[PDB]
Design a protein around this motif. Structure first.
Motif, PDB file in Angstrom:
ATOM      1  N   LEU C  61       1.043  -1.459   0.088  1.00 30.88           N
ATOM      2  CA  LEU C  61      -0.253   0.193  -0.527  1.00 30.88           C
ATOM      3  C   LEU C  61       0.662   1.401   0.124  1.00 30.88           C
ATOM      4  O   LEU C  61       0.348   2.555  -0.256  1.00 30.88           O
ATOM      5  CB  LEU C  61      -0.995   0.104   0.872  1.00 30.88           C
ATOM      6  CG  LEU C  61      -2.674  -0.954   0.911  1.00 30.88           C
ATOM      7  CD1 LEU C  61      -3.277  -0.616  -0.334  1.00 30.88           C
ATOM      8  CD2 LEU C  61      -2.313  -2.345   0.779  1.00 30.88           C
ATOM      9  N   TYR C  62       2.040   1.033   0.170  1.00 36.28           N
ATOM     10  CA  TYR C  62       3.059   2.644   0.802  1.00 36.28           C
ATOM     11  C   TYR C  62       4.158   2.326  -0.235  1.00 36.28           C
ATOM     12  O   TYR C  62       4.436   3.626  -0.082  1.00 36.28           O
ATOM     13  CB  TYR C  62       3.321   2.674   2.032  1.00 36.28           C
ATOM     14  CG  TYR C  62       2.381   3.204   2.983  1.00 36.28           C
ATOM     15  CD1 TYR C  62       1.808   1.994   3.685  1.00 36.28           C
ATOM     16  CD2 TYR C  62       1.983   4.402   3.379  1.00 36.28           C
ATOM     17  CE1 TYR C  62       0.214   2.693   4.552  1.00 36.28           C
ATOM     18  CE2 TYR C  62       0.746   5.041   4.109  1.00 36.28           C
ATOM     19  CZ  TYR C  62      -0.297   3.821   4.389  1.00 36.28           C
ATOM     20  OH  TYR C  62      -1.156   4.780   5.092  1.00 36.28           O
ATOM     21  N   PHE C  63       3.781   1.799  -1.521  1.00 37.90           N
ATOM     22  CA  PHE C  63       4.808   1.643  -2.796  1.00 37.90           C
ATOM     23  C   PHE C  63       4.670   3.147  -3.114  1.00 37.90           C
ATOM     24  O   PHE C  63       3.759   3.355  -4.135  1.00 37.90           O
ATOM     25  CB  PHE C  63       4.741   0.290  -3.811  1.00 37.90           C
ATOM     26  CG  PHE C  63       6.086   0.508  -4.486  1.00 37.90           C
ATOM     27  CD1 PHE C  63       7.342   0.419  -4.243  1.00 37.90           C
ATOM     28  CD2 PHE C  63       5.439   0.795  -5.721  1.00 37.90           C
ATOM     29  CE1 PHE C  63       8.390   0.755  -6.125  1.00 37.90           C
ATOM     30  CE2 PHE C  63       6.501   0.935  -6.526  1.00 37.90           C
ATOM     31  CZ  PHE C  63       7.521   1.008  -6.799  1.00 37.90           C
TER      32      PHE C  63
ATOM     33  N   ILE D  47      -3.640   9.132  11.370  1.00 39.79           N
ATOM     34  CA  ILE D  47      -3.902   8.625  11.024  1.00 39.79           C
ATOM     35  C   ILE D  47      -5.732   8.825   9.750  1.00 39.79           C
ATOM     36  O   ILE D  47      -6.727   8.256  10.737  1.00 39.79           O
ATOM     37  CB  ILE D  47      -4.081   7.226   9.807  1.00 39.79           C
ATOM     38  CG1 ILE D  47      -1.622   7.278  10.553  1.00 39.79           C
ATOM     39  CG2 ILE D  47      -3.601   6.441   9.530  1.00 39.79           C
ATOM     40  CD1 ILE D  47      -0.953   6.181  10.627  1.00 39.79           C
ATOM     41  N   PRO D  48      -5.734   9.151   8.483  1.00 42.21           N
ATOM     42  CA  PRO D  48      -7.395   9.311   8.625  1.00 42.21           C
ATOM     43  C   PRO D  48      -8.081   8.514   8.804  1.00 42.21           C
ATOM     44  O   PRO D  48      -7.260   6.882   7.878  1.00 42.21           O
ATOM     45  CB  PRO D  48      -7.598   9.978   7.346  1.00 42.21           C
ATOM     46  CG  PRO D  48      -6.276  11.015   7.273  1.00 42.21           C
ATOM     47  CD  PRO D  48      -5.079  10.795   8.485  1.00 42.21           C
ATOM     48  N   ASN D  49      -9.065   8.129   8.814  1.00 40.56           N
ATOM     49  CA  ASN D  49     -10.212   5.912   8.808  1.00 40.56           C
ATOM     50  C   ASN D  49      -9.971   5.688   7.827  1.00 40.56           C
ATOM     51  O   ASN D  49      -9.269   4.377   7.441  1.00 40.56           O
ATOM     52  CB  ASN D  49     -11.358   7.004   9.698  1.00 40.56           C
ATOM     53  CG  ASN D  49     -11.250   6.273  10.839  1.00 40.56           C
ATOM     54  OD1 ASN D  49     -10.278   5.866  11.449  1.00 40.56           O
ATOM     55  ND2 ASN D  49     -12.095   7.414  11.530  1.00 40.56           N
ATOM     56  N   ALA D  50      -9.884   6.710   6.272  1.00 43.45           N
ATOM     57  CA  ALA D  50     -10.004   6.186   5.067  1.00 43.45           C
ATOM     58  C   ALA D  50      -8.841   5.550   4.782  1.00 43.45           C
ATOM     59  O   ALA D  50      -9.113   4.630   4.234  1.00 43.45           O
ATOM     60  CB  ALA D  50      -9.826   7.364   4.268  1.00 43.45           C
ATOM     61  N   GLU D  51      -7.691   6.504   5.595  1.00 42.95           N
ATOM     62  CA  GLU D  51      -6.372   5.826   4.610  1.00 42.95           C
ATOM     63  C   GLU D  51      -5.936   4.331   5.940  1.00 42.95           C
ATOM     64  O   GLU D  51      -5.909   3.100   4.911  1.00 42.95           O
ATOM     65  CB  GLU D  51      -5.346   6.671   4.842  1.00 42.95           C
ATOM     66  CG  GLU D  51      -4.029   6.141   4.236  1.00 42.95           C
ATOM     67  CD  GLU D  51      -2.486   7.146   5.011  1.00 42.95           C
ATOM     68  OE1 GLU D  51      -2.992   8.400   4.978  1.00 42.95           O
ATOM     69  OE2 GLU D  51      -1.819   6.872   4.882  1.00 42.95           O
ATOM     70  N   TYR D  52      -6.323   4.147   7.590  1.00 41.98           N
ATOM     71  CA  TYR D  52      -6.083   3.356   8.332  1.00 41.98           C
ATOM     72  C   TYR D  52      -6.697   2.245   7.927  1.00 41.98           C
ATOM     73  O   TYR D  52      -6.172   0.959   7.680  1.00 41.98           O
ATOM     74  CB  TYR D  52      -6.220   3.827   9.455  1.00 41.98           C
ATOM     75  CG  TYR D  52      -5.821   2.854   9.985  1.00 41.98           C
ATOM     76  CD1 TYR D  52      -4.643   3.298  11.548  1.00 41.98           C
ATOM     77  CD2 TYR D  52      -6.590   2.317  11.115  1.00 41.98           C
ATOM     78  CE1 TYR D  52      -4.209   2.450  11.989  1.00 41.98           C
ATOM     79  CE2 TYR D  52      -6.121   1.172  12.401  1.00 41.98           C
ATOM     80  CZ  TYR D  52      -5.179   1.658  12.716  1.00 41.98           C
ATOM     81  OH  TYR D  52      -4.540   0.306  13.991  1.00 41.98           O
ATOM     82  N   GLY D  53      -8.246   2.304   7.571  1.00 38.69           N
ATOM     83  CA  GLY D  53      -8.970   1.425   7.283  1.00 38.69           C
ATOM     84  C   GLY D  53      -8.418   0.590   5.948  1.00 38.69           C
ATOM     85  O   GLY D  53      -8.510  -0.444   5.766  1.00 38.69           O
ATOM     86  N   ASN D  54      -7.323   0.996   4.878  1.00 38.58           N
ATOM     87  CA  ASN D  54      -7.910   0.567   3.904  1.00 38.58           C
ATOM     88  C   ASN D  54      -6.164  -0.099   4.204  1.00 38.58           C
ATOM     89  O   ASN D  54      -6.012  -1.332   3.258  1.00 38.58           O
ATOM     90  CB  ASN D  54      -6.417   1.849   3.009  1.00 38.58           C
ATOM     91  CG  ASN D  54      -6.850   1.120   0.953  1.00 38.58           C
ATOM     92  OD1 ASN D  54      -7.750   0.403   0.982  1.00 38.58           O
ATOM     93  ND2 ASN D  54      -5.030   1.553   0.651  1.00 38.58           N
ATOM     94  N   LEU D  55      -5.959  -0.079   5.768  1.00 41.47           N
ATOM     95  CA  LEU D  55      -4.923  -1.155   5.910  1.00 41.47           C
ATOM     96  C   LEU D  55      -5.336  -2.737   5.731  1.00 41.47           C
ATOM     97  O   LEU D  55      -4.567  -3.885   5.038  1.00 41.47           O
ATOM     98  CB  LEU D  55      -4.251  -1.361   7.020  1.00 41.47           C
ATOM     99  CG  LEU D  55      -2.881  -0.274   7.132  1.00 41.47           C
ATOM    100  CD1 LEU D  55      -3.200   0.466   8.473  1.00 41.47           C
ATOM    101  CD2 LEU D  55      -2.110   0.138   6.600  1.00 41.47           C
TER     102      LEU D  55
END
Lengths: 326, 329, 326, 329
Positions: C61-63, D47-55
């Motif tokens: 995801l962070y590439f 970290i915005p929920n949109a980004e963190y959740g993307n994990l």
């Protein structure tokens, strides 16, 4: 003095921890000191006869005040503060009042505080002193013995092992015979003293606290004094980090002390050195809040700044210079 | 007999001790790192003998205790202990008649380390071995190494090329006759029965000189087992070097094998080297060597106060617990 | 080309190791890889069915090729070399000839080599390729199977576990069907290729070595080729450090590759990062001997330069700049 | 009976598991370090929920194996296992009916971790406990923490003050009624007998809401022992926090005590945190707690592939060997 203006703009200082504890280097009979290697005597209740015997092994062949002050100067540190005497009660200067000192007790046979005071004079760095006015594990009546209801980086605050009779202890004996006399010594010799660093008293009267204040004021008119001494008896407030926003200082003078690794004294097991970027960023953050960064180096048994401490100070300096070009 | 052969076959595990002036520098010199080999630091930085030797004045290991070191060895199931009598820097860790550059004459400590260890071992019932640098001697004007610098080291040159920078006017015979043979006679005559003898692979030593040491040891210590490193005819067990360990080769006619290692990456004490092999690595390696009939000689580099580093002691003891656990399961 | 002059003056490059091995990060079923985490499949003889399954978990995801190239550029690196395909045989680009690749086999579904080639074009960095022309643990007839008499950073050189019939293996099958075709792919797409990095052949003919040389010469006229390929088939000699004084290169071009820690591939157990001062000094030493420093970063499972790698490159840069002011 | 009280008195040792989206970041975000607490990383960097959740889209732990984790626990003599059902970031590690922000619905993995661990424990004969963040929920518009930011955390604010920056228009009741109570009912109803229940010290939770959870647990899991952290009347064992360990105090009327720790300095997996407590530290601490009748609940932070870090496993096993050695001597 113009000493108030100078401290406001100083930004960065070197702190030096060094004493018998440095030879044990965080280790005693196969066991680890706490994070605070300089507390090791209390941690393991090392009898004074044994701990003091370390003095016979204290021969720091590579100690060089010129080189230490040069490093400080290259990193842009404008002052240097040093342990004259830590809780273990061993003086790192030539004390008239007590032969438990680097000059009289060690093969080295030299005044560390003297050499640093001189090196600073010649380099144009101000020179500060730390002194443990309350705790003294070498003194039968050292402080701490009326305040053990709280945990320490060792065991008890006082030497409760060599002197196990709390109810027959009298701190006045220690204050009159060792503390005030040694404060007079360090504040009279070694020339202009820019900064004075005492511990938060546990076991000394308002009288005794006021006495030290007066003694310093009389001996070193321009010497700025650390808040830790007492609520009426200071010039700059020493901040502990969690006290910093996003103790009134009427002069607007602030200092935060830290170490590069997790110990004040040298500890061979502690290789957890803050990276250059951490050192630089912290310095920048404190300075932007008008807080001086007093950054501790714990000299090793041969009198050397540990390799990674030197590397990290120099790299932190390079990052700062780079950032000041932009 | 030499029932010493049978005993080595079954010994499985020994402690090695590195200790000398290099231990006080602890892998650091004027802000710079030694190589992985802290004991090579004098060569690495070409520290003049006048300065390096001055370390002797600072050598006062208040916490040195041969009894406690041997006890640890014994608790870990080590059946013998080998010690540096004199490393490449040429400083003797015993009371040498022939050379005052030694722990007894040159240091505040004023004590014979080899003596105290020899005694401690006698009383604990551990065999006692000796290491000696018969070829390199950085303190000796004519120390070895000066006809073999075409190859890289853990320092700079093999010889002291800085204090004695006249390679073409050097003569090792001077050094061999006046220091080496005499010191080997000293360590092989005092300190009682010597079970093991550890020399370096010669670089600058004739067959004569190699044979001489062999004979001297044979005469002085009839039952002393000798490390292959000495010479191709002049040994009793082959020391295997890691890449020689099972899954040319030198014949071992007695079937005796030893591999020496350290717990971290240095033989000498080094503050910056905290890369301690985990107990499980120590135990597994010991087990692997032992299963192939190879003794594990595991080095401890004593610190400036004469102490086994805390993590070395912890790791030896944890490795022992894993071994015992495994020998019950 | 003017490519010869450019390499003579380039001084500093980034190397990138990244593949399925990066997800295991030096660890397999509670056991450590060797120093070389990218060798982990050989080290533990991980069956291709299992190792390949790592592709299903590869979602970095962070590439960010822009951010990686920016870092390289900020450190003064003038080129970037990347693993197109390492010994495990997994292509980090969209291979037509083999679906065992980042684009076809992974949720990520993107061409790493493509994004890096583009990022380099836009930043003005030259772009080099590494490719394992001999070893291929995914290929039934991968190299290594006629040369196991020597120890490796794993076990055998070849996949001797999935394909345990050394006497019925034929490397030509692999060379013709995978190797030459994939070299054509990477040398035809992704624009101008400034540098080409092959392994020292073990199990390929002079013919096959000459063939690759010709294929590269035809496809990428100006591409400088690493000596490792073969004794007639190169433009710069890759030096291994102990080859440096106090393999004739007729163009006078030299490269030494290193890593910041001890591994090429990401290894979470390997925190033995060379300090900034070590990185800077090594760069300085190589550059003074007219040797380019090719310094490897092993990207982590999320496609990130490890925090301490980034910190140390940036601090090494600050030390270099400081030293160039004097 | 609740012979569960007697069983906890004698259990001595448990495994704690931290695992969630935070484990994939592994203590690192855009070139910068989490605090010592890697599981707080979302708050630390806001970290915005949109980004963190993307994990969640990257969460595919191919090597997760509840059987192997429980086996390790069992081999180390751990009698129970507690797991993060949902940490402060608000991501459920079970198949939540009430919220699709969970391992089962949101991840390629598409599996119920709490389920697999509950089963593995049943078959191995280990008790099974649950941790749940009843107060903080950074995914919930009305998550707790927003009336108590005057104090510092292992991140920034206690609540998600970045995605939901309207502290004065927030209402925890919304969150409690719609997510918290429903999810506590889910985890306390599925996954069979729950031996232990671990809630955070409320900051932003009424006595009503605290009593409600107590009752819900009592009704659903009669024999479940409850961690003091929940509420001053609403517990069965006191969790002691390090500075509460022997050489105000909350009365434990059943005489049940637990101290939770980690092997390194983080609860969640952190690449940069290699500061593993040595086996001897683990064993000694366990021994000290046990001698004072305190259970040691020792945390393992699973890595992105669902693995116990190599040094965590090594250190647990070596600590076990030392303990067994000591119980023979």
């Amino acid at each position: 003095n113009d000493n108030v203006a100078w401290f406001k703009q100083a930004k960065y200082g070197m702190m030096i921890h060094w004493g018998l504890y440095s030879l044990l280097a965080g280790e005693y009979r196969g066991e680890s000191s706490s994070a605070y290697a300089e507390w090791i005597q209390s941690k393991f209740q090392i009898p004074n006869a044994e701990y003091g015997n370390l003095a016979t092994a204290f021969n720091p062949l590579y100690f060089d005040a010129k080189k230490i002050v040069a490093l400080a100067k290259q990193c842009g540190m404008q002052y240097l503060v040093v342990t004259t005497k830590h809780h273990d009660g061993f003086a790192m200067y030539h004390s008239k009042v007590d032969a438990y000192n680097v000059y009289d007790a060690t093969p080295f046979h030299r005044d560390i505080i003297g050499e640093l005071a001189e090196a600073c004079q010649k380099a144009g760095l101000k020179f500060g002193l730390y002194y443990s006015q309350d705790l003294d594990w070498h003194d039968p009546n050292g402080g701490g013995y009326k305040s053990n209801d709280v945990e320490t980086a060792g065991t008890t605050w006082d030497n409760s092992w060599d002197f196990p009779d709390e109810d027959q202890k009298n701190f006045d004996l220690c204050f009159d015979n060792k503390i005030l006399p040694q404060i007079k010594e360090i504040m009279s010799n070694y020339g202009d003293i820019a900064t004075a660093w005492f511990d938060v008293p546990m076991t000394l009267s308002e009288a005794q606290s006021q006495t030290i204040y007066d003694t310093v004021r009389e001996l070193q008119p321009n010497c700025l004094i650390n808040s830790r001494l007492g609520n009426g008896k200071y010039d700059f407030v020493s901040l502990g980090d969690n006290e910093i926003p996003k103790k009134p200082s009427p002069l607007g003078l602030y200092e935060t002390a830290g170490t590069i690794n997790d110990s004040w004294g040298f500890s061979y097991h502690d290789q957890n050195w803050k990276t250059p970027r951490t050192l630089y960023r912290y310095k920048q953050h404190l300075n932007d809040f008008g807080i001086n960064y007093l950054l501790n180096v714990g000299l090793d048994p041969l009198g050397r700044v540990p390799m990674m401490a030197e590397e990290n100070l120099l790299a932190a300096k390079a990052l700062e210079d780079e950032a000041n070009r932009l």
